[PDB]
Amino acid sequence: VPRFATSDLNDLYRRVINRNNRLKRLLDLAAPDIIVRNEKRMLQEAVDALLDNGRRGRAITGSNKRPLKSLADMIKGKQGRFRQNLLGKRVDYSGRSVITVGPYLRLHQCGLPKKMALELFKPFIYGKLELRGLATTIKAAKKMVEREEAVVWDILDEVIREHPVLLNRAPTLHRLGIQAFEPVLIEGKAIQLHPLVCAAYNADFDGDQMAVHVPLTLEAQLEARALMMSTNNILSPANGEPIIVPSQDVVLGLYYMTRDCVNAKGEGMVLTGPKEAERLYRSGLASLHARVKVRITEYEKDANGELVAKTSLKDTTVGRAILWMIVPKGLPYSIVNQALGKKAISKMLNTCYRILGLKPTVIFADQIMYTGFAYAARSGASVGIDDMVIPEKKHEIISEAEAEVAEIQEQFQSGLVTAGERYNKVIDIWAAANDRVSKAMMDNLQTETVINRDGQEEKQVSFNSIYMMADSGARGSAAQIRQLAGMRGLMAKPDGSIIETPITANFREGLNVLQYFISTHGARKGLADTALKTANSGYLTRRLVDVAQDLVVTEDDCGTHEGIMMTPVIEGGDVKEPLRDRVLGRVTAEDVLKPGTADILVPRNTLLHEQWCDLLEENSVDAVKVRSVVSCDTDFGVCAHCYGRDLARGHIINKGEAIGVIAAQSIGEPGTQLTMRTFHESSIQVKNK
Amino acid sequence: MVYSYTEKKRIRKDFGKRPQVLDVPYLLSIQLDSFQKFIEQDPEGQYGLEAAFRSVFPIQSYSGNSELQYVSYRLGEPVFDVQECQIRGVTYSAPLRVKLRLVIYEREAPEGTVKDIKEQEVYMGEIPLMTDNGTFVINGTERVIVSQLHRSPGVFFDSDKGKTHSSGKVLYNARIIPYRGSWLDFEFDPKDNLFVRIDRRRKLPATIILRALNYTTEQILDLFFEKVIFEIRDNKLQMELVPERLRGETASFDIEANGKVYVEKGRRITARHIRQLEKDDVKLIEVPVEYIAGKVVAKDYIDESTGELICAANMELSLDLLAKLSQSGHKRIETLFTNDLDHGPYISETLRVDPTNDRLSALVEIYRMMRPGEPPTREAAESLFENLFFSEDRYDLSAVGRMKFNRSLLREEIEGSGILSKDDIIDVMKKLIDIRNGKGEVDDIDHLGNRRIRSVGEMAENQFRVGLVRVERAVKERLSLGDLDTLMPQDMINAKPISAAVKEFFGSSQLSQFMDQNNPLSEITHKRRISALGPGGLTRERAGFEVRDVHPTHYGRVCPIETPEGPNIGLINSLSVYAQTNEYGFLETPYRKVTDGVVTDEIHYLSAIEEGNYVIAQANSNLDEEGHFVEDLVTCRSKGESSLFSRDQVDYMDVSTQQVVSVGASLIPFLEHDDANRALMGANMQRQAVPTLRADKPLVGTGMERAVAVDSGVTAVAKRGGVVQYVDASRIVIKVNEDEMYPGEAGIDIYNLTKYTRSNQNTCINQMPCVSLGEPVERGDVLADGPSTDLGELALGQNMRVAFMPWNGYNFEDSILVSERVVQEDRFTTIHIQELACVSRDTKLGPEEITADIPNVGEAALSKLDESGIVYIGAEVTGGDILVGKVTPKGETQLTPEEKLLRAIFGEKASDVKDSSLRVPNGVSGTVIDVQVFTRDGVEKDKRALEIEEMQLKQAKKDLSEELQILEAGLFSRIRAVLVAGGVEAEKLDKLPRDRWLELGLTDEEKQNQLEQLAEQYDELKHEFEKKLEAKRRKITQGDDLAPGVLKIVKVYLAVKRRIQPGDKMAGRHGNKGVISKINPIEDMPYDENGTPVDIVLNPLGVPSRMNIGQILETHLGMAAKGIGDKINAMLKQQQEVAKLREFIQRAYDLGADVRQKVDLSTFSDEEVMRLAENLRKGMPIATPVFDGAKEAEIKELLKLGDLPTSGQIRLYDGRTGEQFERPVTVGYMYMLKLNHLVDDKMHARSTGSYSLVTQQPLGGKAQFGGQRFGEMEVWALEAYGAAYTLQEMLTVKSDDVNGRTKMYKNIVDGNHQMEPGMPESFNVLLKEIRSLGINIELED
Way it was determined: cryo-EM
Q: B720 Cβ partners below 8 Å, 6+ apart?
A: B736, B737, B740, B741, B749, B779
Considering the domain architecture, whether residues B650 and B669 belong to the same structural domain is answered as no
Domain CATH number, residue B201? 3.90.1110.10
B658, closest residue in chain A (CA to CA):
A513
- Asked whether the beta carbons of residue B1270 and residue A88 sit closer than 8 angstroms, the reply is yes
B133: nearest Cα among B125, B118, B143 = B143
Domain CATH number, residue B1104? 2.40.270.10
Question: In B1243-1320, where does DSSP find H-type helix?
Answer: 1272-1281, 1285-1288, 1298-1310
Considering the domain architecture, whether residues B837 and B875 belong to the same structural domain is answered as yes
CA–CA gap between residue A249 and residue A377 (Å, rounded) = 8
CA–CA gap between residue B754 and residue B765 (Å, rounded) = 8
Give me the amino acid identity at B340.
Answer: D
Q: Which resolution in angstroms does this entry have?
A: 3.8
Contact B576, B557 (CB under 8 A): yes
B1330, closest residue in chain A (CA to CA):
A75
Closest by Cβ to B642, choosing from A86, A377, A501: A501
Does residue B58 have a cis peptide bond before it, meaning omega lies within 30 degrees of 0? yes
A366 is in an annotated binding site: no
CA–CA gap between residue B878 and residue A91 (Å, rounded) = 29
Range of the domain at B616: 576-656
B1111, closest residue in chain A (CA to CA):
A384
Instruction: Please identify, among B343, B368, B395, the residue that sits at the C-terminal boundary of a domain.
Output: B343
The CA-CA-CA angle for residues B1250, B1254, B1258, to 5°, reads 30
Indicate the SS3 state at residue B616: strand
CA–CA gap between residue A181 and residue A214 (Å, rounded) = 11
Minimum distance, in Å, between the CA of residue A252 and any CA atom of chain B = 9
Q: Would you report the helix, strand and coil content of chain B in percent, each value rounded to 5?
A: 30, 15, 55
Considering the domain architecture, whether residues B102 and B38 belong to the same structural domain is answered as yes
Indicate the SS3 state at residue B532: coil
Q: Tell me if chain B has a CB within 8 Å of the CB of A216.
A: yes
B1267: nearest Cα among A224, A212, A178 = A212
CA–CA gap between residue A378 and residue B1216 (Å, rounded) = 12
Q: B157 Cβ partners below 8 Å, 6+ apart?
A: B174, B408, B435, B440, B441, B442, B443
Query: How far is C-alpha B192 from the chain's CA centre?
Result: 45
Query: How far is C-alpha B894 from the chain's CA centre?
Result: 63
Contacts 24+ apart (CB under 8 A), B1018-1022: B1018/B968, B1018/B971, B1021/B964, B1021/B967, B1021/B968, B1021/B971, B1022/B968
Instruction: Please identify, among B575, B608, B633, the residue that sits at the C-terminal boundary of a domain.
Output: B575
Q: Which residues pair with B818 in a beta bridge?
A: B1079, B1096
Instruction: Determine the residue among A186, A513, A646 to mutate to test chain B binding: the one whose Cβ has the most chain B Cβ atoms within 10 Å.
Output: A513
CA–CA gap between residue A183 and residue A120 (Å, rounded) = 13
Indicate the SS3 state at residue B702: coil
SS (H, E, C) A658-680: CHHHHCCCCCCCCCCCCCHHHHC
Q: Tell me if chain B has a CB within 8 Å of the CB of A369.
A: yes
B1293, closest residue in chain A (CA to CA):
A91
Indicate the SS3 state at residue A409: helix
Contact A472, A251 (CB under 8 A): yes
φ/ψ (deg, to 5) at B790: -130, 115
Closest by Cβ to B1270, choosing from A168, A189, A657: A168
Considering the domain architecture, whether residues B760 and B868 belong to the same structural domain is answered as no
Considering the domain architecture, whether residues B703 and B823 belong to the same structural domain is answered as yes
In a domain? residue B316:
yes
CA of B269: how far to CAs of A488, B260, B263, B293, in Å?
52, 17, 8, 22
Classify strands B634-637 and B580-581 as parallel, antiparallel or unpaired.
Answer: unpaired
Instruction: Determine the residue among B808, B820, B1276, B1290 to mutate to test chain A binding: the one whose Cβ has the most chain A Cβ atoms within 10 Å.
Output: B1276
A98: nearest Cα among A195, A212, A230 = A212
CA of B664: how far to CAs of B28, B575, B686, B1128, in Å?
14, 10, 7, 33
B23: nearest Cα among B655, B959, B743 = B655
Closest by Cβ to A94, choosing from B1221, B1246, B1283: B1246
A558 is in an annotated binding site: yes
In a domain? residue B1247:
no
Closest by Cβ to B1074, choosing from A126, A205, A501: A205
CA–CA gap between residue B561 and residue B720 (Å, rounded) = 39
B53: nearest Cα among B478, B351, B489 = B489
- Asked whether the beta carbons of residue B1309 and residue A126 sit closer than 8 angstroms, the reply is yes
Contact B1065, B1074 (CB under 8 A): yes
Q: Tell me if chain B has a CB within 8 Å of the CB of A566.
A: no
Contact B12, B793 (CB under 8 A): yes
Considering the domain architecture, whether residues B466 and B564 belong to the same structural domain is answered as yes
CA–CA gap between residue B809 and residue B1099 (Å, rounded) = 10
In a domain? residue B571:
yes
Contact A102, A194 (CB under 8 A): yes
Considering the domain architecture, whether residues B977 and B1017 belong to the same structural domain is answered as yes
CA–CA gap between residue A321 and residue A258 (Å, rounded) = 9
Instruction: Determine the residue among B620, B641, B820, B1290 to mutate to test chain A binding: the one whose Cβ has the most chain A Cβ atoms within 10 Å.
Output: B1290
- Asked whether the beta carbons of residue B1326 and residue A658 sit closer than 8 angstroms, the reply is no
- Kindly tell me the sign of the dihedral angle through the C-alpha atoms of B787, B791, B795, B799: negative
Range of the domain at A452: 392-526
Contact B869, B944 (CB under 8 A): yes
Indicate the SS3 state at residue A181: strand
Closest by Cβ to B1278, choosing from A123, A178, A216: A178
Considering the domain architecture, whether residues B501 and B353 belong to the same structural domain is answered as no
DSSP states along B307-344:
----S-SS-B--HHHHHHHHTTT--B--EE----SS--
**How many CB pairs lie under 8 A apart between chains A and B?**
433
Residue B1234: which H helix or E strand, with range?
A: strand B1225-1234
Contact B670, B656 (CB under 8 A): no
Considering the domain architecture, whether residues B771 and B799 belong to the same structural domain is answered as no
In a domain? residue B19:
no
Instruction: Please identify, among B575, B595, B617, the residue that sits at the C-terminal boundary of a domain.
Output: B575
Residue A239: which H helix or E strand, with range?
A: none
A639 is in an annotated binding site: yes
A630: nearest Cα among A619, A643, A621, A617 = A643
Q: A362 Cβ partners below 8 Å, 6+ apart?
A: A107, A231, A234
Considering the domain architecture, whether residues B502 and B532 belong to the same structural domain is answered as yes
- Asked whether the beta carbons of residue A527 and residue B680 sit closer than 8 angstroms, the reply is yes
In a domain? residue B13:
no
**Cα radius of gyration rounded to whole Å, chain B:** 41
CA–CA gap between residue B1234 and residue B1061 (Å, rounded) = 10
- Asked whether the beta carbons of residue B812 and residue A116 sit closer than 8 angstroms, the reply is no
Q: Which residues pair with A418 in a beta bridge?
A: none
Chain B CB contacts of A122 below 8 Å: 1247-1248
Number of domains in chain B: 9
In a domain? residue B1249:
no
Contact A94, A212 (CB under 8 A): yes
Domain CATH number, residue A439? 1.10.132.30
Ramachandran bin of A530, using left for φ above 0, alpha for ψ from -120 to 50, beta for the remaining angles: alpha
Give me the amino acid identity at B1120.
Answer: A
CA of B1072: how far to CAs of A200, A685, B1120, in Å?
22, 48, 22
Residue B862: which H helix or E strand, with range?
A: helix B859-864
Considering the domain architecture, whether residues B840 and B948 belong to the same structural domain is answered as no
Considering the domain architecture, whether residues B670 and B793 belong to the same structural domain is answered as yes
**Cα radius of gyration rounded to whole Å, chain A:** 34
